[PDB]
Tab-separated table of C-alpha atoms in Angstrom:
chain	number	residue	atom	x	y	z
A	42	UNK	CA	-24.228	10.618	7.269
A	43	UNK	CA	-26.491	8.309	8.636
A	44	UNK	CA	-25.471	8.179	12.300
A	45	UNK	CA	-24.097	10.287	14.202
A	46	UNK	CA	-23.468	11.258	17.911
A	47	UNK	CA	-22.989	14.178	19.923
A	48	UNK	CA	-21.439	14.287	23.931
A	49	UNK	CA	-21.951	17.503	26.093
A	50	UNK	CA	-20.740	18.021	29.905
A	51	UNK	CA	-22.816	19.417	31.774
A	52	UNK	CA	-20.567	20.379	34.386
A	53	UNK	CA	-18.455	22.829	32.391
A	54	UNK	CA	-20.331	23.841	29.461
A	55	UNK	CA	-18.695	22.591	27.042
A	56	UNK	CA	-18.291	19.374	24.320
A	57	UNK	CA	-17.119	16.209	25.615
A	58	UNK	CA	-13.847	15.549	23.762
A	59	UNK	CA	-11.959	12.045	23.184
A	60	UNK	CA	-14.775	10.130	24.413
A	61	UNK	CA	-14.459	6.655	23.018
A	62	UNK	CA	-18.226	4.769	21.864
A	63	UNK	CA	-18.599	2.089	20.434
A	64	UNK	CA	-21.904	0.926	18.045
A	65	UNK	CA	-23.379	-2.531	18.193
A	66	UNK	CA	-25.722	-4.445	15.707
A	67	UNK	CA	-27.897	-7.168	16.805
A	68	UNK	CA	-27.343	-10.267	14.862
A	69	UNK	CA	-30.112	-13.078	13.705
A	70	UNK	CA	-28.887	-15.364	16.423
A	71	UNK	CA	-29.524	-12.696	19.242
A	72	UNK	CA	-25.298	-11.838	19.715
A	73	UNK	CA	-24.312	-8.053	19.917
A	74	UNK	CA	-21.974	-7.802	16.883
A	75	UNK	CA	-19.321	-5.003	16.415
A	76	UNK	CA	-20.662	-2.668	14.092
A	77	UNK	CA	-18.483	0.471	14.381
A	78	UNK	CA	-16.497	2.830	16.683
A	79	UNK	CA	-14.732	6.241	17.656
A	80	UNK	CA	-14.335	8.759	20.156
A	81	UNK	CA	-15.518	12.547	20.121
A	82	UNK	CA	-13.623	15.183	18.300
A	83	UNK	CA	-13.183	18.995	20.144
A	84	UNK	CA	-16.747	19.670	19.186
A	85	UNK	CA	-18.147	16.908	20.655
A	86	UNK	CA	-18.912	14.862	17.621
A	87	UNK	CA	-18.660	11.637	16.145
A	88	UNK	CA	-19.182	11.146	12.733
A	89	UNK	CA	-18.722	9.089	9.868
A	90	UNK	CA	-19.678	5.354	11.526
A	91	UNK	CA	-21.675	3.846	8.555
A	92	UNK	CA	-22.964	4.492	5.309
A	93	UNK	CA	-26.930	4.659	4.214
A	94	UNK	CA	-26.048	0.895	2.588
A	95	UNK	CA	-24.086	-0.627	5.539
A	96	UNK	CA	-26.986	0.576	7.987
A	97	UNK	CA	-29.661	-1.316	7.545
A	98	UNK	CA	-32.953	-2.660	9.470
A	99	UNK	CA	-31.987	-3.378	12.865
A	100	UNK	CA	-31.434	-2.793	16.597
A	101	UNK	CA	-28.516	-1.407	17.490
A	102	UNK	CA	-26.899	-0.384	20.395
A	103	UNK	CA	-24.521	2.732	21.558
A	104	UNK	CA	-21.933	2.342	24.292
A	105	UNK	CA	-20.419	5.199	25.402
A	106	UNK	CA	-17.467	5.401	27.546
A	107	UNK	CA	-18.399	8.170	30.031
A	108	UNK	CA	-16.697	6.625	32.835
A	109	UNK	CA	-12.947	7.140	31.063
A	110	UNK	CA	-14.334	10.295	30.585
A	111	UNK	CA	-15.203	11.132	34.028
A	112	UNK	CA	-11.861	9.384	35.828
A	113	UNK	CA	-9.336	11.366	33.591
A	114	UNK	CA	-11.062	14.644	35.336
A	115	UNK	CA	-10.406	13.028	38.442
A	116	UNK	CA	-14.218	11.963	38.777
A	117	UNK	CA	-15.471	8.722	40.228
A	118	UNK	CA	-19.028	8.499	38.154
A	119	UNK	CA	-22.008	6.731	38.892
A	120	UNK	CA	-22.392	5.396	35.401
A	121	UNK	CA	-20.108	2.877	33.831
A	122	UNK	CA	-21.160	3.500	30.414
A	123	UNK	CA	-24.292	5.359	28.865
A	124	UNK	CA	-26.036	2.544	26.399
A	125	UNK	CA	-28.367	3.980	23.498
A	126	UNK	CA	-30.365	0.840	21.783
A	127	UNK	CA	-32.692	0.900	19.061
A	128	UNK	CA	-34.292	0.076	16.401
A	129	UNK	CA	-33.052	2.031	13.314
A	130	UNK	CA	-34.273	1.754	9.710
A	131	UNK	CA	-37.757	0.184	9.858
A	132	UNK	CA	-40.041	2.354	7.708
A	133	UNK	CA	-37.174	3.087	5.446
A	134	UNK	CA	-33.741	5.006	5.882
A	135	UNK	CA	-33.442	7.755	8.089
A	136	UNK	CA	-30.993	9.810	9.686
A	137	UNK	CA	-30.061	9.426	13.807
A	138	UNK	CA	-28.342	11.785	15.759
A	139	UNK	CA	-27.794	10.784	19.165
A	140	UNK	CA	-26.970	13.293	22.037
A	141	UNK	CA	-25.929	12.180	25.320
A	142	UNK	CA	-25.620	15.251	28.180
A	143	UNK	CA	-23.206	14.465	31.079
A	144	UNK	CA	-22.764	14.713	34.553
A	145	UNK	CA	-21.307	12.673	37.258
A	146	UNK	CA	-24.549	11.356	38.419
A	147	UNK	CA	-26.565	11.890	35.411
A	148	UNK	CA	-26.910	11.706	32.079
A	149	UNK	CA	-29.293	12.246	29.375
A	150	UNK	CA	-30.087	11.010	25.752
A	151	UNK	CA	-31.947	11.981	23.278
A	152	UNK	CA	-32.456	11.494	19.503
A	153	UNK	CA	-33.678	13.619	16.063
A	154	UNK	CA	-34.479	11.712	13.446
A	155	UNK	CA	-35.158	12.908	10.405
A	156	UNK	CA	-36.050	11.717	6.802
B	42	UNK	CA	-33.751	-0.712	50.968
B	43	UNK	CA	-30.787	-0.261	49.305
B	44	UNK	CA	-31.960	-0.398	45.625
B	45	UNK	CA	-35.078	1.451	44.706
B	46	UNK	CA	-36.495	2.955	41.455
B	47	UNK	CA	-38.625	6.075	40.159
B	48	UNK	CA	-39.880	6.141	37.254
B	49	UNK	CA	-41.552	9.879	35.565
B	50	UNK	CA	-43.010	10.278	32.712
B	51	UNK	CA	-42.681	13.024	30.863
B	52	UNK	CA	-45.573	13.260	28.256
B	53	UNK	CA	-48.549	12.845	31.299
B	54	UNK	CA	-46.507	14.522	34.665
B	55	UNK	CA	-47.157	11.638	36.444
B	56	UNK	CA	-45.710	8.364	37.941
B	57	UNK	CA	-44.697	6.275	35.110
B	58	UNK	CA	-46.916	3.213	36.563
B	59	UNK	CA	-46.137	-0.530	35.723
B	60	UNK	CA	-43.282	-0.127	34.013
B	61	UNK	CA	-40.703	-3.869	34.340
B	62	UNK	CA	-37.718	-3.995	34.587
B	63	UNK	CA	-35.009	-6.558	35.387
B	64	UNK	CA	-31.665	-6.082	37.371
B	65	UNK	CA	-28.964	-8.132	36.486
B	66	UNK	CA	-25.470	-8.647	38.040
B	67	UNK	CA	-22.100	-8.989	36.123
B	68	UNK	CA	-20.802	-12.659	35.977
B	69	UNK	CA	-17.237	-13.175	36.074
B	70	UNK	CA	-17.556	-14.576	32.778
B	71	UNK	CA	-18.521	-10.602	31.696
B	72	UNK	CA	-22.622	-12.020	31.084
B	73	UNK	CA	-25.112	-9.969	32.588
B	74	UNK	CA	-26.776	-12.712	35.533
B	75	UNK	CA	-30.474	-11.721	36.358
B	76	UNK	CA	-31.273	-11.841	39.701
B	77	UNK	CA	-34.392	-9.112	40.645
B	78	UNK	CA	-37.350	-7.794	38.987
B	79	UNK	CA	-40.159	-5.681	39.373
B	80	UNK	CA	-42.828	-2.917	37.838
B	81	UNK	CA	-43.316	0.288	39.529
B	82	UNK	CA	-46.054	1.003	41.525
B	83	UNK	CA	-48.893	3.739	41.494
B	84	UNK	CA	-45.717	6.342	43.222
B	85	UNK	CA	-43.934	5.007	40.157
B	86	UNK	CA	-41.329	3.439	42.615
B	87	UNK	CA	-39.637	-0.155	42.951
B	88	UNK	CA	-39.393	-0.917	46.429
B	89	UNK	CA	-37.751	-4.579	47.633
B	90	UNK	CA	-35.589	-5.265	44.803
B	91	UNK	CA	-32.565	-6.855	47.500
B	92	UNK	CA	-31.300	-6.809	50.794
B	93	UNK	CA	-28.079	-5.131	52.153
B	94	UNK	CA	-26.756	-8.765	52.752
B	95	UNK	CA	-27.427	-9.761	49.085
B	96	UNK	CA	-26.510	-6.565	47.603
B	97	UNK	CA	-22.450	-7.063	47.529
B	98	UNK	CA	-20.454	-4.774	45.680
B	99	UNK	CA	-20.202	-5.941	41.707
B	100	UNK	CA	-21.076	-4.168	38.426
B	101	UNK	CA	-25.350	-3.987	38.073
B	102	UNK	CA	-27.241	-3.158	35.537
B	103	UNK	CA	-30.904	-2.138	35.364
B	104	UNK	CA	-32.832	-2.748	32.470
B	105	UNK	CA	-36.243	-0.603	32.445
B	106	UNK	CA	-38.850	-1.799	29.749
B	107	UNK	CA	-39.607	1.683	28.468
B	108	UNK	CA	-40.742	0.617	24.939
B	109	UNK	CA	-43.259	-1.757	26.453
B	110	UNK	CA	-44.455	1.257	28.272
B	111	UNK	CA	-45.012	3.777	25.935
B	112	UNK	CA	-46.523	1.153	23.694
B	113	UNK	CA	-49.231	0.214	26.181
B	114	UNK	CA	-49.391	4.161	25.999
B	115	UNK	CA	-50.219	4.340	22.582
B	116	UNK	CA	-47.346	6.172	21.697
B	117	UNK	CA	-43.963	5.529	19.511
B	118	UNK	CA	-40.784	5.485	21.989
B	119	UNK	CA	-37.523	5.482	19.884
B	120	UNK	CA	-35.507	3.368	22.599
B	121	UNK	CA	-35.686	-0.409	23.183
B	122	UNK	CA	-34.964	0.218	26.893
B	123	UNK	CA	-33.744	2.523	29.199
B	124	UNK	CA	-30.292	0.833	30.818
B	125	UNK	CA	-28.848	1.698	33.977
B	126	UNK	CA	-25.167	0.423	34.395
B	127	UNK	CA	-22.822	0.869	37.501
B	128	UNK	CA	-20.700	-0.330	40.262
B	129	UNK	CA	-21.831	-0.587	43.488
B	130	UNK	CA	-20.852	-0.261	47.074
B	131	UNK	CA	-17.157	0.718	46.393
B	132	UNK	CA	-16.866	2.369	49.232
B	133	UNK	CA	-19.213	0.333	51.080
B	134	UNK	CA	-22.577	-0.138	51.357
B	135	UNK	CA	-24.857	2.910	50.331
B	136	UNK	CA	-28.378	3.509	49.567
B	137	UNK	CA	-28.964	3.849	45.679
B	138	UNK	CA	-32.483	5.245	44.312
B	139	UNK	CA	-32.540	4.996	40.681
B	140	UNK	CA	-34.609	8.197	38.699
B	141	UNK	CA	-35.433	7.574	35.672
B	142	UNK	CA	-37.552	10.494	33.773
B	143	UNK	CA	-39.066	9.408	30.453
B	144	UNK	CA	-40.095	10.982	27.081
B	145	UNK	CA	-40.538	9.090	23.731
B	146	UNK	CA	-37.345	11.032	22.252
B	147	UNK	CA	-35.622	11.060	25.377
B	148	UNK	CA	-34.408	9.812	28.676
B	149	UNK	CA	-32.604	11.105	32.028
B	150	UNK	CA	-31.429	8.879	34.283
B	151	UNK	CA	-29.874	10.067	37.817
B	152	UNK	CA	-28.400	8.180	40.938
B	153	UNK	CA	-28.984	9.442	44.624
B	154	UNK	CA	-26.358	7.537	46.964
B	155	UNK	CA	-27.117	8.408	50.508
B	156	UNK	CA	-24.751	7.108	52.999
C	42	UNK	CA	-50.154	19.926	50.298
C	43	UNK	CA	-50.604	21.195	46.830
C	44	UNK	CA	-47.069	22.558	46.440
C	45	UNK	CA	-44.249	20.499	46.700
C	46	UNK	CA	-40.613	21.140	45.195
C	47	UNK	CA	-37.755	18.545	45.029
C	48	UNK	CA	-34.425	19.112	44.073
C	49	UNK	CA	-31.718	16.661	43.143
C	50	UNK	CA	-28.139	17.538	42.658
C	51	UNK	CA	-25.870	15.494	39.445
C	52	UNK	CA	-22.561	16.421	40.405
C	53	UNK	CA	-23.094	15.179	43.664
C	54	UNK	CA	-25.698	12.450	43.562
C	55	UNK	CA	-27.599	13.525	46.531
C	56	UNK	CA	-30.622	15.349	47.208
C	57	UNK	CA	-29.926	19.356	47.145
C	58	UNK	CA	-30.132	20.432	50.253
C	59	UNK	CA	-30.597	24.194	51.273
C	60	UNK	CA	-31.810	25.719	48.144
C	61	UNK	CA	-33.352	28.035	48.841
C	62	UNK	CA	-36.720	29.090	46.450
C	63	UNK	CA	-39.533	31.917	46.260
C	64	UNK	CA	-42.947	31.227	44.758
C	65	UNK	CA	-44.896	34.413	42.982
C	66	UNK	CA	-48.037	34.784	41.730
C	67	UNK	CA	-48.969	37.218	38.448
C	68	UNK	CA	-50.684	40.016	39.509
C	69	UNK	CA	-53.635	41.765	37.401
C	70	UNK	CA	-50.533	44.513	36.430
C	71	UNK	CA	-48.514	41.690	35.598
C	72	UNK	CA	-46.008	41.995	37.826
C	73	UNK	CA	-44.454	39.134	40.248
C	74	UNK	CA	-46.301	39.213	43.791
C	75	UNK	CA	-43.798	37.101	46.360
C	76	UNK	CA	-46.331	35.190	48.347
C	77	UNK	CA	-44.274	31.776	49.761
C	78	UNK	CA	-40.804	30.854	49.780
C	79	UNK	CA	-38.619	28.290	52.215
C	80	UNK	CA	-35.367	26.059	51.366
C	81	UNK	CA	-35.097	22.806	50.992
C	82	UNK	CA	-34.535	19.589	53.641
C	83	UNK	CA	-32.004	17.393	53.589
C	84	UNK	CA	-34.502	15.130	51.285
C	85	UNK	CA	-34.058	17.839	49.225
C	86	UNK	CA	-37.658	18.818	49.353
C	87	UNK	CA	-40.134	21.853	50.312
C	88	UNK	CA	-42.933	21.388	51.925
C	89	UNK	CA	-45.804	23.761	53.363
C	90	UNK	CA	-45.412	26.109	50.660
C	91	UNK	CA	-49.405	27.144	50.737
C	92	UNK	CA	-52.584	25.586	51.148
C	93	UNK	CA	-55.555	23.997	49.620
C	94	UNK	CA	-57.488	26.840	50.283
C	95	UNK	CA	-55.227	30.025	49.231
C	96	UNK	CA	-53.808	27.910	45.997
C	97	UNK	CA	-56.008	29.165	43.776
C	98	UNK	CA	-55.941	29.382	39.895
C	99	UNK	CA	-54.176	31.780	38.207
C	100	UNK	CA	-50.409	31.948	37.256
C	101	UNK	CA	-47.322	30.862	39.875
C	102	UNK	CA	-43.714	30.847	39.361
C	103	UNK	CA	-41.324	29.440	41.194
C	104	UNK	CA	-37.334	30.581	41.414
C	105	UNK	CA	-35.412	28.066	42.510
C	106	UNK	CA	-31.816	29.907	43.631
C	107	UNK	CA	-29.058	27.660	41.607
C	108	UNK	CA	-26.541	29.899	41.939
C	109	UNK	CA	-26.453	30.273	45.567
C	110	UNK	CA	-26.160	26.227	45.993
C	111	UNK	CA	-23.589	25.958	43.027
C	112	UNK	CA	-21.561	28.982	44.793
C	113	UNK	CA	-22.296	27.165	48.506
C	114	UNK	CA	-20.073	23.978	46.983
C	115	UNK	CA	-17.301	26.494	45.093
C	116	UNK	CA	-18.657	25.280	41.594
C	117	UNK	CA	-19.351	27.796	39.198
C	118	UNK	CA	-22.579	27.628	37.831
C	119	UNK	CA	-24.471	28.751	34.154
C	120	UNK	CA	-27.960	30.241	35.596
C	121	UNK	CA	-28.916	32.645	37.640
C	122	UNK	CA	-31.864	30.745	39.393
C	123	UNK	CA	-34.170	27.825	37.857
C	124	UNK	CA	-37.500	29.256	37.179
C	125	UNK	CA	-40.433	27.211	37.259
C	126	UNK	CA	-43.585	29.109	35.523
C	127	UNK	CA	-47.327	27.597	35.242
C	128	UNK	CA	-51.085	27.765	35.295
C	129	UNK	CA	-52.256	26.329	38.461
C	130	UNK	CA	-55.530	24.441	38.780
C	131	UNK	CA	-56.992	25.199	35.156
C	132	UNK	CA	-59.290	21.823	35.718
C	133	UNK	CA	-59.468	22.511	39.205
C	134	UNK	CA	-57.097	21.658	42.268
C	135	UNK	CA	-54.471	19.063	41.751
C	136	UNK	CA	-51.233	18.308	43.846
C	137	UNK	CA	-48.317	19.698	42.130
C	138	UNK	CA	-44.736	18.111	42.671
C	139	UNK	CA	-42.128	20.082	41.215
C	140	UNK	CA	-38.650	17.932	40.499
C	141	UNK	CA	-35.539	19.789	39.135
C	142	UNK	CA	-32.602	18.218	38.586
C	143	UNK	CA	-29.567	20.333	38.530
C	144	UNK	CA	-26.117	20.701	36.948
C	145	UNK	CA	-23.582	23.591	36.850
C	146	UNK	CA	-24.690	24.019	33.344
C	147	UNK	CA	-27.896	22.362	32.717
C	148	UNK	CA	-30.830	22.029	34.373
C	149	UNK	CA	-33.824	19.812	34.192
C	150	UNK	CA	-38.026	20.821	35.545
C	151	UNK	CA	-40.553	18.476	35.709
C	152	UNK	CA	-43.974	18.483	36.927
C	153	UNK	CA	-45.401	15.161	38.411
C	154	UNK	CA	-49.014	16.862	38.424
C	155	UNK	CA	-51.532	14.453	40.609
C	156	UNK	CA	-55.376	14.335	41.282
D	42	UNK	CA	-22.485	34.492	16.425
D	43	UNK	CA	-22.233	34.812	20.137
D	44	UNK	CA	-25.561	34.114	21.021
D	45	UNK	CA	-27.774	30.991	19.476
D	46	UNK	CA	-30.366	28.924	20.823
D	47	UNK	CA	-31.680	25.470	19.546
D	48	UNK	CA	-34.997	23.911	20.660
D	49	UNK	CA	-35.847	20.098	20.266
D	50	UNK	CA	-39.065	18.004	20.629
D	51	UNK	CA	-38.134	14.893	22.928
D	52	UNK	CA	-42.192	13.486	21.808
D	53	UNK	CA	-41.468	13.660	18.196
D	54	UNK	CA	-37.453	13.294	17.823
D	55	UNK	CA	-37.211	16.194	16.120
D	56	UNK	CA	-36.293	20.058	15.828
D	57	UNK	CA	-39.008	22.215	17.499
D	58	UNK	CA	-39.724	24.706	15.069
D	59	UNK	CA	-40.935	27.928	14.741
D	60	UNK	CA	-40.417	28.592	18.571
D	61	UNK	CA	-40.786	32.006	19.531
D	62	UNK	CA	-38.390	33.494	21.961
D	63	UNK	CA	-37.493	37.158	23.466
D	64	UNK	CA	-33.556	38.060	25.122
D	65	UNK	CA	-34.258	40.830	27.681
D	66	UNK	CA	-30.997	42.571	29.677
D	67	UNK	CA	-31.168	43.500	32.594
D	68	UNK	CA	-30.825	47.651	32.861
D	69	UNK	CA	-28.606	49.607	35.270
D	70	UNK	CA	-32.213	50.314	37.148
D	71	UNK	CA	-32.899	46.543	37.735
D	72	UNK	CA	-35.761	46.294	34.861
D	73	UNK	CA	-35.597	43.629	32.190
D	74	UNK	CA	-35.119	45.469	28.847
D	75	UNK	CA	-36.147	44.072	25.696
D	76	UNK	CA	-32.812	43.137	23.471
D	77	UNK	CA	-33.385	40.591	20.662
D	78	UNK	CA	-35.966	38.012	19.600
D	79	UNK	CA	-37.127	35.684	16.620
D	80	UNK	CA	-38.354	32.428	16.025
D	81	UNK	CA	-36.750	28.672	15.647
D	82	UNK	CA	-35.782	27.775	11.771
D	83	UNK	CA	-36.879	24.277	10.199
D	84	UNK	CA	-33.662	23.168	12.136
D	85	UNK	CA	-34.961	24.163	15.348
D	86	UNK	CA	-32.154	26.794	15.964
D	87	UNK	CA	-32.427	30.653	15.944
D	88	UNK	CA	-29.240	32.654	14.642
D	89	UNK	CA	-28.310	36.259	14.226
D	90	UNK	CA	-30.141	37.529	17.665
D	91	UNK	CA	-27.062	39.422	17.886
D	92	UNK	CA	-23.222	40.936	17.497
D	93	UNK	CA	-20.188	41.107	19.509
D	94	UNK	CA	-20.009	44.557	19.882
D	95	UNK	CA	-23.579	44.664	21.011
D	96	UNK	CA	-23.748	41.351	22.850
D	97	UNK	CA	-22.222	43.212	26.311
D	98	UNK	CA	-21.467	41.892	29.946
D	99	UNK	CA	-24.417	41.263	31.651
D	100	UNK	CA	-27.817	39.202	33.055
D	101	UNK	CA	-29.771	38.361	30.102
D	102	UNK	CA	-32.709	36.112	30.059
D	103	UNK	CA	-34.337	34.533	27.053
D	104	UNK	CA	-38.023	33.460	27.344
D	105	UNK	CA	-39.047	30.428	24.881
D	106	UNK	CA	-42.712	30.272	23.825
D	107	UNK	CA	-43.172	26.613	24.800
D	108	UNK	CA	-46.664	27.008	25.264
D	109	UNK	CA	-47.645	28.450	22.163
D	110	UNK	CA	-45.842	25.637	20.990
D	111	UNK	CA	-47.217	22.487	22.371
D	112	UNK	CA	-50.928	24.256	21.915
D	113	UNK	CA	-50.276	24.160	18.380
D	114	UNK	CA	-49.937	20.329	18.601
D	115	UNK	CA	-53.093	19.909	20.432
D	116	UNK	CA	-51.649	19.520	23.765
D	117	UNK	CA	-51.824	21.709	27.239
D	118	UNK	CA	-48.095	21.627	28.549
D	119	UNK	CA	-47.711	22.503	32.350
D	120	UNK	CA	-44.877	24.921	31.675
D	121	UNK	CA	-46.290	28.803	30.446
D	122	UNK	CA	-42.569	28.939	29.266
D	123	UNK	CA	-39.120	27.956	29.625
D	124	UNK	CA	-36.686	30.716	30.499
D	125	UNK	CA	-32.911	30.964	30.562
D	126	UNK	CA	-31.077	33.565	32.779
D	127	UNK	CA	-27.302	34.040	32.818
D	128	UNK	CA	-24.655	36.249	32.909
D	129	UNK	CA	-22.784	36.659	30.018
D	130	UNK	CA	-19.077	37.787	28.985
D	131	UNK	CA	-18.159	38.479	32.508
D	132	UNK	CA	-14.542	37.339	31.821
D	133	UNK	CA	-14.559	38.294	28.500
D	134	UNK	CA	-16.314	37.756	25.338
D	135	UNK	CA	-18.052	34.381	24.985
D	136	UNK	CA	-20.223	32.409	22.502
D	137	UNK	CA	-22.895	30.541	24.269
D	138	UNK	CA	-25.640	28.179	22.854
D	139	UNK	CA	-28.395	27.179	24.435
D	140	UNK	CA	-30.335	24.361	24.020
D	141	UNK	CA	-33.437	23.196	24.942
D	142	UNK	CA	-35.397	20.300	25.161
D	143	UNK	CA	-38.885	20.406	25.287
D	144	UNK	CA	-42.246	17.289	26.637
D	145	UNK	CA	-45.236	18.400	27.431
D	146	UNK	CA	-44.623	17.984	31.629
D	147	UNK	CA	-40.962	18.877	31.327
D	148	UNK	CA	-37.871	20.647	29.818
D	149	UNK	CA	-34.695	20.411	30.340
D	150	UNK	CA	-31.897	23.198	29.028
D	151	UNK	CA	-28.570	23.252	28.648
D	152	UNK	CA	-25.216	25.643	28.073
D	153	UNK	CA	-22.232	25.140	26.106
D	154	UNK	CA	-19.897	28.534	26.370
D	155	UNK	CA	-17.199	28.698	24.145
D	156	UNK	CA	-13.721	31.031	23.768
């Protein structure tokens, strides 16, 4: 698993469930093409978006719906989305997992990647 | 000023210093519409971006050039950019200051709205 | 001023104001001697901690009292306090800004260190 | 497992590993008492530190080696260490992981508490 992508809330501790994302490939021409999407499960995770051959070379981009999130608590969030882009693959395949910590005001993202 | 910036980085514990970025508004065709740039100062800040007048309430999104950064840095950053995307002035008119705290790995990004 | 702390709050979007904070430096048993404490403005900052003169080197920490603010606003909160724990002036005096950025359940601490 | 802790590099993207860490609990007379302690797995997480039945209401803190850490790497990080202190199981039995992220000017940490 190639890609995947974990949501936290920093308000209550806990994994940030049903949160929809989706992933993004930039094409030749310069577009953002759909590449895949999903939400988060109870533990906060998303995986299964791609496959070591589907994800190749690129830069791709991570939109993540933390303002859905954020309303059905009853919270009006600063962010309208939390975007993740870039470049994946170039020195060969590797493995991307993408954390994203959130509060109304704030969020954070990181990544491990690993060979 | 009702748009400023900060910019931290991480790595040094300093002002992240001459880092561009680009603020865009949302067209009502959904494209992102440039209209202010900028690279922070010595104080890592981005003063002057608007005016109160200018600044209407819309969807804005601020695109920091953190890879350009960390490259003149000498250092691999895994993001393209740092993106900041949200509504403003819903309620009316506030005062927004961006911070933005930076690592190679990883990125914050917070919103103070004083009224 | 060689001391300076600034607090921002995530859930709220504003600068935390009235945190309150005590600064100790190690003493040669090892144990925490209290020397400087205050709360914060409604910036969110403390100022006038110490001076030039009395910051010398050796080893400071800072608690920063999370749980007070977080109970203040009826949220409940992870952490006891924030502590903030460094060497001080190892290549001689430098301004020290410390920024924490705070959720009920995560908390960020970064020094903008400056000469 | 009611008590884990992962550590990640936000320079590198990666696990931080072989982080040293000690859990102290606070004693009916106020002192910190030593509980558990270990070091950070190729993964960057530490398991095991304790039980259920041992694992008790009360203020624990756990004190991460960053320093040793980052002076390994070459670097002089501003932080001495990066502590954690929270009260745990008040309402009950909990599992609580803690995570955090490590630069050399900044960390950040984080709590997800589970039932």
């Amino acid at each position: 698993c190639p890609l995947m992508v974990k949501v936290l809330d920093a308000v209550r501790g806990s994994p940030a469930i049903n949160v929809a994302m989706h992933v993004f490939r930039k094409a030749a021409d310069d577009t953002w093409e759909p590449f895949a999407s999903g939400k988060t499960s109870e533990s906060g995770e998303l995986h299964g978006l791609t496959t070591e051959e589907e994800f190749v070379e690129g830069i791709y981009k991570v939109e993540i719906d933390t303002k859905s999130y954020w309303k059905a608590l009853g919270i009006s969030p600063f962010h309208e989305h939390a975007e993740v882009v870039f470049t994946a693959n170039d020195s060969g395949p590797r493995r991307y997992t993408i954390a994203a910590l959130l509060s109304p005001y704030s969020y954070s993202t990181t990544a491990v990647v690993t060979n």
